[PDB]
Enzyme design. Structure first.
Site, PDB file in Angstrom:
ATOM      1  N   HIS A   1       0.823  -1.214   0.000  1.00 41.31           N
ATOM      2  CA  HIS A   1       0.000   0.000   0.000  1.00 41.31           C
ATOM      3  C   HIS A   1       0.854   1.260   0.000  1.00 41.31           C
ATOM      4  O   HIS A   1       0.366   2.358  -0.272  1.00 41.31           O
ATOM      5  CB  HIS A   1      -0.994   0.010   1.167  1.00 41.31           C
ATOM      6  CG  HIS A   1      -0.353   0.026   2.521  1.00 41.31           C
ATOM      7  ND1 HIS A   1       0.083  -1.120   3.153  1.00 41.31           N
ATOM      8  CD2 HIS A   1      -0.107   1.042   3.382  1.00 41.31           C
ATOM      9  CE1 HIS A   1       0.583  -0.809   4.334  1.00 41.31           C
ATOM     10  NE2 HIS A   1       0.481   0.499   4.498  1.00 41.31           N
TER      11      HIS A   1
ATOM     12  N   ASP B   1       0.153  -7.988   1.625  1.00 45.55           N
ATOM     13  CA  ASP B   1       0.472  -6.562   1.629  1.00 45.55           C
ATOM     14  C   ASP B   1       1.986  -6.341   1.627  1.00 45.55           C
ATOM     15  O   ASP B   1       2.503  -5.481   2.340  1.00 45.55           O
ATOM     16  CB  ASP B   1      -0.162  -5.869   2.831  1.00 45.55           C
ATOM     17  CG  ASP B   1      -0.107  -4.359   2.731  1.00 45.55           C
ATOM     18  OD1 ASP B   1       0.246  -3.838   1.653  1.00 45.55           O
ATOM     19  OD2 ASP B   1      -0.425  -3.693   3.740  1.00 45.55           O
TER      20      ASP B   1
ATOM     21  N   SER C   1       4.991   2.001   8.256  1.00 47.36           N
ATOM     22  CA  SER C   1       4.695   0.863   7.327  1.00 47.36           C
ATOM     23  C   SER C   1       5.859   0.451   6.474  1.00 47.36           C
ATOM     24  O   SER C   1       6.496   1.284   5.831  1.00 47.36           O
ATOM     25  CB  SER C   1       3.535   1.267   6.425  1.00 47.36           C
ATOM     26  OG  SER C   1       2.343   1.306   7.209  1.00 47.36           O
TER      27      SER C   1
END
Length: 301
Positions: free
Chosen positions: A59, A89, A164
């Site tokens: 993402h 992911d 992230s």
């Protein structure tokens, strides 16, 4: 009153791991931009090996016109997208390996235990590399969403936007996982504190290796949605539909193996090569049928 004493510190882990953690910038052109690159999204990434392969969250790099990777030593690179996987992911990047490259400490024999002290390395709100300390709250978590459950490490080490793709390591500096998600759902409108999730390192490694070898991750597809095991639904023209499988049938054993836990079985289903044939036991009206079906690879997402 005077101190020759040594203050408690996790600097050792920091010095070992921090250099390998990089700042990842997702640059996109805007209709607004008029030919000028702007930051769509920013996050972190982990240099896995010397070749220059880097792990990060998918993402973070989605729909990126350009991807920039910044090392703590100051070096900047234009990243190359090796591959991405929506399911885990995860995404892998490649950069020029000319000159020395810092790699994240990795120990395959190491077993992450609940209560282990961990450090979260990343770039929250683009303030620069930030180090937060916590512990492993839990292992094998399914994440925020029950559906499509996947394993997760839960940590109370403070995690924020920009974290992230960054690293989660122990006091020894060893990679424990890749910081991915933060719990935001509020029961009473209150704010959840100290609940963040990371992809376990072992899984990250396996996915990386698969993405390095192939442009994508390849899994077996059987076109069935069910619950512990009956067939809750049948995918149109699915391998199941092609086999003529019918909805509302229990499933005892698959691939000469028992089927008590859907999670275990589905994982095993994804391991095998696409196109392979395997036995499937189902009980309809109390009949132990044994239909034969040909597998296909999981539909691209």
């Amino acid at each position: 009153d005077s101190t020759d004493e040594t203050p408690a510190s996790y600097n050792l882990a920091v010095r070992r791991a921090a250099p390998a953690v990089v700042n990842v910038y997702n640059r996109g052109l805007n209709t607004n931009s008029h030919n000028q690159l702007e930051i769509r999204t920013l996050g972190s990434g982990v240099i896995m090996d010397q070749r220059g392969y880097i792990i990060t969250n998918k993402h973070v790099i989605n729909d990126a016109d350009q991807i920039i990777v910044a090392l703590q030593d100051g070096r900047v690179f234009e990243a190359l997208l090796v591959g991405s996987d929506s399911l885990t992911d995860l995404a892998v990047l490649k950069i020029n390996a000319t000159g020395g490259l810092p790699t994240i400490p990795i120990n395959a024999r190491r077993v992450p235990h609940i209560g282990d002290v961990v450090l979260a390395i990343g770039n929250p709100y683009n303030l620069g590399q930030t180090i937060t300390q916590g512990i492993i709250s839990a292992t094998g978590r399914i994440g925020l969403n029950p559906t499509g459950r996947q394993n997760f490490l839960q940590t109370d080490a403070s995690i924020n936007p920009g974290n992230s793709g960054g690293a989660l390591v122990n006091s020894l500096g060893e990679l424990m996982g890749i910081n991915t998600l933060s719990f935001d759902k509020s029961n009473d409108g209150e704010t959840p504190e100290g609940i963040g999730f990371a992809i376990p390192f072992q899984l990250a490694t396996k996915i990386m290796d698969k993405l390095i070898r192939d442009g994508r991750v390849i899994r077996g597809y059987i076109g069935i949605g069910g619950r512990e095991i009956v067939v809750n639904e049948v995918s149109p023209d699915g391998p199941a539909a092609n086999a003529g499988i019918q909805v509302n049938d229990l499933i005892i054993s698959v691939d000469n193996k028992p089927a008590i836990s859907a999670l275990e079985t589905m994982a095993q289903v994804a391991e095998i090569r696409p196109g392979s044939v395997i036995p499937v036991v189902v009980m309809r009206d109390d009949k132990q049928l044994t239909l034969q079906v040909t597998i296909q690879e999981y539909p691209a997402t």
